[PDB]
Design an enzyme around this catalytic site. Structure first.
Site, short mmCIF file in Angstrom:
data_model
loop_
_atom_site.label_atom_id
_atom_site.label_comp_id
_atom_site.label_asym_id
_atom_site.label_seq_id
_atom_site.Cartn_x
_atom_site.Cartn_y
_atom_site.Cartn_z
N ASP A 180 66.38 30.35 86.06
CA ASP A 180 66.70 31.61 85.37
C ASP A 180 67.19 32.75 86.38
O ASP A 180 66.68 33.77 86.05
CB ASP A 180 65.44 32.01 84.64
N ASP A 194 60.42 36.12 88.09
CA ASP A 194 60.76 35.48 87.02
C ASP A 194 59.82 35.89 85.78
O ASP A 194 58.54 35.71 85.87
CB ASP A 194 60.50 33.88 87.17
N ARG A 237 68.32 40.33 84.81
CA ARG A 237 67.08 40.65 84.16
C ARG A 237 65.78 40.61 84.76
O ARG A 237 64.80 41.02 84.54
CB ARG A 237 67.05 40.38 82.70
N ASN A 238 65.89 39.39 85.66
CA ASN A 238 64.50 38.95 86.38
C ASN A 238 64.54 39.44 87.81
O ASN A 238 63.77 39.06 88.67
CB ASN A 238 64.73 37.42 86.63
C1 LIG Z 1 53.68 30.38 85.51
C2 LIG Z 1 54.42 30.97 86.63
C3 LIG Z 1 55.37 32.13 85.98
C4 LIG Z 1 56.32 32.85 86.92
C5 LIG Z 1 56.37 32.50 88.20
N1 LIG Z 1 57.11 33.31 89.17
N2 LIG Z 1 58.11 32.40 90.12
C6 LIG Z 1 58.45 33.50 90.82
C7 LIG Z 1 59.58 33.07 91.78
C8 LIG Z 1 59.04 32.65 92.88
C9 LIG Z 1 60.59 34.44 92.35
C10 LIG Z 1 60.60 32.20 91.09
C11 LIG Z 1 58.22 34.88 90.24
C12 LIG Z 1 57.23 34.50 89.32
N3 LIG Z 1 56.47 35.67 88.64
C13 LIG Z 1 56.78 36.67 88.46
O1 LIG Z 1 57.73 37.19 88.91
N4 LIG Z 1 55.79 37.70 87.39
C14 LIG Z 1 56.01 38.80 87.45
C15 LIG Z 1 56.28 39.86 88.35
C16 LIG Z 1 56.28 41.19 88.01
C17 LIG Z 1 56.37 41.61 86.63
C18 LIG Z 1 56.14 40.53 85.67
C19 LIG Z 1 56.02 40.71 84.17
C20 LIG Z 1 56.10 39.23 83.87
C21 LIG Z 1 55.97 38.83 82.28
O2 LIG Z 1 55.53 37.91 82.12
N5 LIG Z 1 56.52 39.78 81.54
C22 LIG Z 1 56.45 39.37 79.94
C23 LIG Z 1 56.46 40.62 79.28
C24 LIG Z 1 57.44 38.59 79.47
N6 LIG Z 1 55.88 38.46 84.95
C25 LIG Z 1 56.04 39.07 86.06
C26 LIG Z 1 55.54 31.58 88.73
C27 LIG Z 1 54.56 30.98 87.80
#
Ligand SMILES: Cc1ccc(-n2nc(C(C)(C)C)cc2NC(=O)Nc2cccc3cc(C(=O)NC(C)C)[nH]c23)cc1
Length: 256
Positions: A130, A148, A134-135
């Site tokens: 993705d 993400d 927006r990410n």
């Molecule tokens: C399960 C799982 C999910 C995501 C990830 N994962 N993998 C990466 C890369 C390594 C860069 C690909 C980054 C991330 N996670 C984030 O960037 N988290 C994050 C950071 C800051 C703010 C927010 C807001 C939300 C949110 O859910 N907002 C709703 C309102 C929709 N998430 C945030 C890993 C495992």
């Protein structure tokens, strides 16, 4: 991280497992850090609670300058995953707002920074699925960070193999990344804004591509076109694309 050191301000949105709050974290120094506080609904399965925690498990291990940062985890019920936010917000909204002051060298800087983040994920054979403006968050006017915030479809950013067969590889991320660069050089314009999602594949199959943004250097557009090769094998790796974008950045620095 203690719960009393985190004040919740408003709901950022709904995550897959529960609400996400926009908050403020006051550290040992007393300085106020903008944070996203992710929560998990109580009624979820143990499997769902495990999948929620996997973000805290993975994110704790990530320390790249162009990847979003985990502030902390409160395991005690209600379990919270605290991620860093920045006051400049999303890159898309930042680009729209600063379209008249932002220079092309800065758009190439942002493109290179996300490429460095993606070259690291490529090193560990991890797929984003993705890549879109927006990410991405703006840490400072000279630093962007990839995240993400999506729910695991983004048709207008996807490679033909992802649209056609739901295949997602590093090669397909390279396609998405060039679409992300097209958004950066277009100051936040949505790709294929003039099409419906159902029309996209037909246009890509026929050989049509996103046109060069007005401010996009020809060398950078040529690189974008190589990332959009129908054949995933003919797209560069993010590792080599870093070299390609660093050369473009140096040429733009020499011009400016
Ligand atoms: C399960 C799982 C999910 C995501 C990830 N994962 N993998 C990466 C890369 C390594 C860069 C690909 C980054 C991330 N996670 C984030 O960037 N988290 C994050 C950071 C800051 C703010 C927010 C807001 C939300 C949110 O859910 N907002 C709703 C309102 C929709 N998430 C945030 C890993 C495992």
């Amino acid at each position: 991280i203690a719960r009393e050191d985190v004040v919740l301000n408003r709901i950022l949105g709904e995550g897959f497992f529960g609400e996400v709050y926009e908050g403020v974290y006051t550290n040992h120094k007393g300085e106020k850090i903008n944070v996203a506080v992710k929560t998990c609904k109580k009624d979820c399965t143990l499997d769902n609670k495990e999948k929620f925690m996997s973000e805290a498990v993975i994110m704790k291990n990530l320390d790249h300058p162009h990847i979003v940062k985990l502030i902390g985890i409160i395991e005690e019920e209600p379990t919270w995953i605290i991620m860093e936010l920045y006051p400049y917000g999303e890159l898309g909204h930042y680009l729209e707002r600063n379209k008249n002051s932002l220079k092309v060298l800065t758009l190439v800087l942002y493109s290179l920074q996300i490429c460095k983040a993606m070259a690291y994920l490529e090193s560990i054979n991890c797929v984003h699925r993705d890549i879109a403006v927006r990410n991405i968050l703006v840490a400072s006017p000279e630093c962007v960070k990839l995240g993400d915030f999506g729910l695991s479809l983004p048709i207008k950013w996807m490679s033909p193999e992802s649209i056609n067969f739901r295949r997602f590889t590093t090669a397909s991320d390279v396609w998405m990344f060039a679409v992300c660069m097209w958004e950066i050089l277009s100051f936040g314009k949505q790709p294929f804004f003039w099409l419906e999602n159902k029309d996209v594949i037909g246009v890509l199959e026929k050989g049509d591509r996103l046109p060069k943004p007005d401010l996009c250097p020809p060398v950078l557009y040529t690189l974008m076109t190589r990332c959009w090769d129908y054949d995933p094998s003919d797209r560069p790796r993010f590792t080599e694309l870093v070299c390609s974008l660093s050369d473009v950045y140096q040429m733009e620095k020499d011009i400016a």
